[PDB]
Amino acid sequence: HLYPGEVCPGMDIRNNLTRLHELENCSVIEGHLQILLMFKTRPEDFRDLSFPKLIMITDYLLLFRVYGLESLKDLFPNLTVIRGSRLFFNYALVIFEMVHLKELGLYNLMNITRGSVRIEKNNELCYLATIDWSRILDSVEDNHIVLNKDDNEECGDICPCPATVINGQFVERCWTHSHCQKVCPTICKSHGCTAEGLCCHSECLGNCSQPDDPTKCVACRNFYLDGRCVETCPPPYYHFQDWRCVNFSFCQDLHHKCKNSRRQGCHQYVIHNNKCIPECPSGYTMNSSNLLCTPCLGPCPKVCHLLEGEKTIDSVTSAQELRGCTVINGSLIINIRGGNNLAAELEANLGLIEEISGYLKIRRSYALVSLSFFRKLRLIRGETLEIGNYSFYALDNQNLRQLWDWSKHNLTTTQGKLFFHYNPKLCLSEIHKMEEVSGTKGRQERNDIALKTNGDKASCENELLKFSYIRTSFDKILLRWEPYWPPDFRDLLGFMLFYKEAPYQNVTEFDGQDACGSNSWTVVDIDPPLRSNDPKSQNHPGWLMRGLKPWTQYAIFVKTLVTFSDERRTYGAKSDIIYVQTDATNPSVPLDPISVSNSSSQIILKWKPPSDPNGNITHYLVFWERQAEDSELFELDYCLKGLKLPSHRPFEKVVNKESLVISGLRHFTGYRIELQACNQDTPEERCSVAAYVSARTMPEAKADDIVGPVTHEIFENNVVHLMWQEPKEPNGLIVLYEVSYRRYGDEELHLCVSRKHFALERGCRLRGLSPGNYSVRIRATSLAGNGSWTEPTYFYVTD
Amino acid sequence: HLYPGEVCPGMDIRNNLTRLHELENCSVIEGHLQILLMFKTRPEDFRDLSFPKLIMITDYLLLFRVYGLESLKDLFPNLTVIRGSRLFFNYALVIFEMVHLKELGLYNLMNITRGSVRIEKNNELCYLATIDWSRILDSVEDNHIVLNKDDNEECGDICPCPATVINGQFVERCWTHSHCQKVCPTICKSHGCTAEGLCCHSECLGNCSQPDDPTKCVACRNFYLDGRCVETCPPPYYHFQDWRCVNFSFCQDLHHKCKNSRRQGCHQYVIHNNKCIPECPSGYTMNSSNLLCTPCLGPCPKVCHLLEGEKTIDSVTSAQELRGCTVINGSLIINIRGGNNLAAELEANLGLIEEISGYLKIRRSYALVSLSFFRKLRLIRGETLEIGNYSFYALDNQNLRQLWDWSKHNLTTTQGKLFFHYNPKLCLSEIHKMEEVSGTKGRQERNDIALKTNGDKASCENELLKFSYIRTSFDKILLRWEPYWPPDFRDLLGFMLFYKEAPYQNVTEFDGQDACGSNSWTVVDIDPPLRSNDPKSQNHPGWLMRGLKPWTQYAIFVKTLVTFSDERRTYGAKSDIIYVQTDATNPSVPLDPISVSNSSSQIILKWKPPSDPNGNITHYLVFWERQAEDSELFELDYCLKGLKLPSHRPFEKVVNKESLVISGLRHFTGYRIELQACNQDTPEERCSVAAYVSARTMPEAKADDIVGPVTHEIFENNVVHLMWQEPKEPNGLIVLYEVSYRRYGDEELHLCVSRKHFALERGCRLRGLSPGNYSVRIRATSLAGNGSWTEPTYFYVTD
DNA sequence: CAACGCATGAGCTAGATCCG
DNA sequence: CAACGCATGAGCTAGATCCG
């Protein structure tokens, strides 16, 4: 037979060898097999136990913390395939922290459908590299076999298997010292094979009896049907867990077995696409008689039979199933004890609930203020009741002030009784208008819901306050609202301004409860104003707040305060919030004005936007000034040690950019650059303070040097006067001429004529002149640097 | 007469000149006279009033924001002296933005006691350079008269006063065009004077009618007594404001005038060393009848008779003017109807009171978790009783959780009845506890304290719980306590465990009236234990907690929990709080290791205490490493552009300090400095990671330059070889020799010899040396900088 | 009779319908 | 018979007398 044995559910084994005895006649195990934590076991009570008739594995096998095993092949001698239907710990088969196992001996395994193997912290195993996972494990890139006895080549590795050359070496792969890993010709990869190499039926695997037969081999691929198995059997039967196809009359009765809410390992199995699947996916709803899934027109419920029909919920873990679980056949109970933030998690998990049939109970609430997370709820059937016939319950909750927004919500109760006791944070108004929309109208207990233990410590109010005038500056906001007096005007404590910035308008609404929050609305108290007894008076109260960054959206309102007294009046008033931004003074200074000059006529200035823009800046205002050189540097003797070498005003309204280039300016001249960041211009023209920077553009290559006829006059005392021309537009200013003369065969003897010396003499002179042929050359050394050399003027003075 | 007028208290004028009329007959002003805020005033209402009787000033005279005064001389024609008792922002007399004032007219000031004059922003004043303040103001170094009408010399400045030459100019000092500044001969600087210049009595000032008489002049220096004044008056009278002396019967009445707490600007005047000082200084306490300040052995009270023997301090302020009060002579009623946070403020405000005489009524508390703020209360006398002879009263307190810790507290009530009603979360044992510790044992009412309306809505558990073996680690503590079972061991819910760290032991008990505060005892619930039906069993339950910090004290206790029931039984049990500190470990890293170099052989290093000590750190472990220079810099041609210029291993157990210097080290080398903060050492020697910094000390003055016999060898080709020696201990390293040779009549031409060139040649050569007398001088330029120059070695090479 | 004048704008003097 | 062994120590496997 393919599988002549019996079905066998997955099961867990710990702390005893007693509960393994339930594997006497099992052949195929659905689920997984976990056996672990086995310390006080003599090793020799394992040699006399085995499970030969067990073949198939669906999910996984695990071995962890065993004291006494040496070779599990004595217990698992015919095991061939792991289906790997579920990945556990991102792995399939794991042997961890073994203490006594010498050799593995899984000599019968052929294929791993899905998953990976992992053997760790086992300093007693050998032949771990004689495995060839690639043949068995279709995916090897995740195999993790480290920190074992094979950390050092010290365990033998001797065995009598073709010794494949899958790697670069002629490695021999064996299971034990008495078992190799059988390999036949690979004409068929995963379709079963014989010892003689003859391939068996394509749709079966493992060891084989007769080739090309899907009925007498061992294990097959797709499904199973009564000694046969085909890729897809005809739909008189429906497929089950990708391993069978059997008639729905059986799994319908399985659905009827634990439809009694007794165990949570069950699933409300449903037929869909000829699959008795646990749940037909989203966008589908259930039917009563035909056991199919209707495509669920709209976001309709699917369904969900509550645990024990009375299950309580205390955390998100106790509400994980609610995703998809929409119609509830039980009584819900909620009690969060502590918690940090669940108001953003319930909607993603239970914001899709519409119908419950039991009764709802709330107690010991700590960190909740509303019931808005209950989005799609519409009705409670109340087939089961609390003691005293209560369809709803609410005791000892000290933080709830809100249930639903009944201007847009609708709930109905079929029957039962309401409970509201010791909920001191919710006014009588809400629960009375709970009764308006709820099914009950006069069904009260007497003593019904507590009328004194609830809402006593928090004074509810249904009164509003409106504003009268608002003025804003860039930094200060002028607030003013209408006056108000309580029915007893002396009974009044003042006003509080709760205010902060709000870049959006999705701001949290005020609830009157103080939790441990770092972020809180800064608030100031306002002295109640003088009583004027005049309707036409200055009784309108207000306040001016000044510590505000400009152009930020601020949410503001004002809340009254009055003492609590015996009479249930003077509830005060509460003003709704409004949004206000500031005014638009001149922005802050422009930041980082960077000036760069690359050529003699180009200067680029780039800045950074002002730190405080004070609104949308319309433009930028730039200004430049042509600086002047020093007049003190004209009268220095520049052949003495020490020489210098440096590197209305027109404007534009530069807009919509961050840099500006200015040309048509004097070359090699200092330029003081200033820019004012400036807001909207035509009304109330005000700009920032100018960020001042200095800039000097590049000099000109020819400006330093001067060309012209350098003439000479020879005096009688052999003192030759020299006449030439100065640079009309030098690079900054001429400071020194590098005048020099040369005899043929004589070096460049240079002389000095100062800027003033050239000015007073209109040239220079060469006293004590040797008779001969001299060439006079002049270099115009500007403060920007030395210029070019003039033409060496030839003149011969003879003996 | 000397001082024939009337005493006149300091007074202020604003927005109306009406109240100035109270200066009709007072000639001496105590305090200060402020005149300010006069906008809508015609200038014509001023020439009809004057004050020819007032002379002296104590604090300061201030004229500010007046619209219409052009000459204040029409109001102050005779006053001459100002004492400046209290500095007005470190000044004495100010005119500050006066708009109508043409001429000041202070033609009568004689002398300045202390302070400064300041005249500002007056574009209508002249003659301000004609004052000669140096003759009247004792301290000129702080005069500030800027930005006035005489910022420009444009107002005339003519006057008919000897034209003093105090400065380098013949400055003519005049007050007005009709009055100059009067100066008589300076034989006596401040001993009074007449028009003819002869000096009057030594102890008086300014004007004078008959000379050399303390009774026949106008104003004197030290004191005053019935038309006379002496340096120290006889002690039948006692000095007042160091300018009079009056009988004790006078200022005892001043003490008794505002012993009635009506105005807070006065003081309870006391006598000390012939001074009716407002308060005898710290460490001195008054006596009742004598009004003398006892030397106050040890701490002494300020004493606080309650206002009208009855007060209802309820809020933050209430009667906040009571800091320092210790004993109260009335009765108090406290009621904080809400509030934000006062727990951290009462101790600094009222946390020093010990005794009250009346009764205490407490009601409507909302944020009062305990009464530990009443730190020093010891006894209640009960002079006034509430209706029904009630001394203690508690009513409708939803957050008064606890009263006191009697193990470290003692309170006694002499008489009266105690009231405690409708406080629904405070149990029955502690009110018995305060009953037994207090005087009363059987003074009850029928009905006395409510036995049901209190502690019913909270699971009060005061019944006994004791712990068992406890175990602790560096991070975790193992807990276990004695088993408890209610009289019905079926009615139960389990345990909850509150904990929080505490650097001290003045921690509030968990005490159970729900106050949602920012800081609260974080709690974990416990599954109630199994029933074993054996007294000798494992019934002791425990718990493991891990999220803790090492070396930190933590308070812990356990509490039972049970379902509510109609029967008043199964009250459960509760444990007392205990302290168990966590264990120490390695400290944190040493912080901010700062190394400073002051000499070549001293290197000081200072650090900061580690952030986490983890126990009492016994010492600090320090180490260092001798860094080496870079060997790659030896083969660099330093004459080319680019030069560099910088600025087991032994140890010691540095203890009980923050810095330590290291001596005995080589000159100018880098050092790697590492220091470990470390806890107790001889057992479990564990220290943290070392804080690593670097340090290089300064070089040696002479180590850079080398001295020695610099001999030379002249070759046949006029190429002279140079022989000299290298510095044995260069500062860091020698890198280049600044070799140079200078012929007479020629410049000191410099040549080059590299570090390796000097190595391969043991010197340098001079190729192309013209015949002459040459002086060779070398400067040893190391990486630490240039050394000294050698001697220019004279050698003569001939033609 | 519906911003500015007749200060400044949160540094021992009061606190923006604050004032007209 | 009163820490350690025949794990680790809060990352889908249990939660420190937790197993002797």
Residue numbers in the entry:
A (entry chain B), B (entry chain A): 1 to 160, 169 to 655, 756 to 907
Give me lines lifted from the publication on this model.
The second class of particles forms a modified arrowhead-like shape, which we designate as the IRpseudo-arrowhead. In this asymmetrical structure, the head of one protomer (protomer A) is lifted from the symmetric IRarrowhead conformation, while the opposing protomer (protomer B) remains unchanged. This structure was resolved at a 6.26 Å resolution. In the IRpseudo-arrowhead, two A62D-8T (A62M) aptamers bind to different sites on the IR dimer, which we refer to as site u (upper side) and site l (lower side), respectively. At site u, the L1 domain of protomer A and the FnIII-1′ domain of protomer B simultaneously interact with the A62M aptamer. At site l, a similar interaction is observed between the opposite protomer and a second A62M aptamer. The head groups of the protomers were arranged differently, with a 13° difference when measured at Q177–L459–V604 (L1–L2–FnIII2), as protomer A is raised relative to protomer B. The distance between the E204 residues (in the CR domain) of the two aligned protomers is 32.7 Å, while the distance between their Q177 residues (in the L1 domain) is 30 Å. In protomer A, the L1–CR domain shifts toward the L2 domain by 6°, as measured at Q177–E204–L459 (L1–CR–L2), whereas no significant changes were observed in protomer B. Consequently, the head domain of protomer A becomes more compact, with the distances between the Q177 residues and E204 residues reduced to 16 Å and 9.9 Å, respectively, in the L2-aligned protomers. Upon aligning the stalk of protomer A between IRpseudo-arrowhead and IRarrowhead, we observed that protomer B rotates clockwise by ~11.2°. Due to these structural changes in the L2–FnIII1 and CR–L2 hinges, along with the rotation of protomers A and B, the distance between the membrane-proximal ends at D907–D907′ is reduced from 43.3 Å to 30.1 Å.
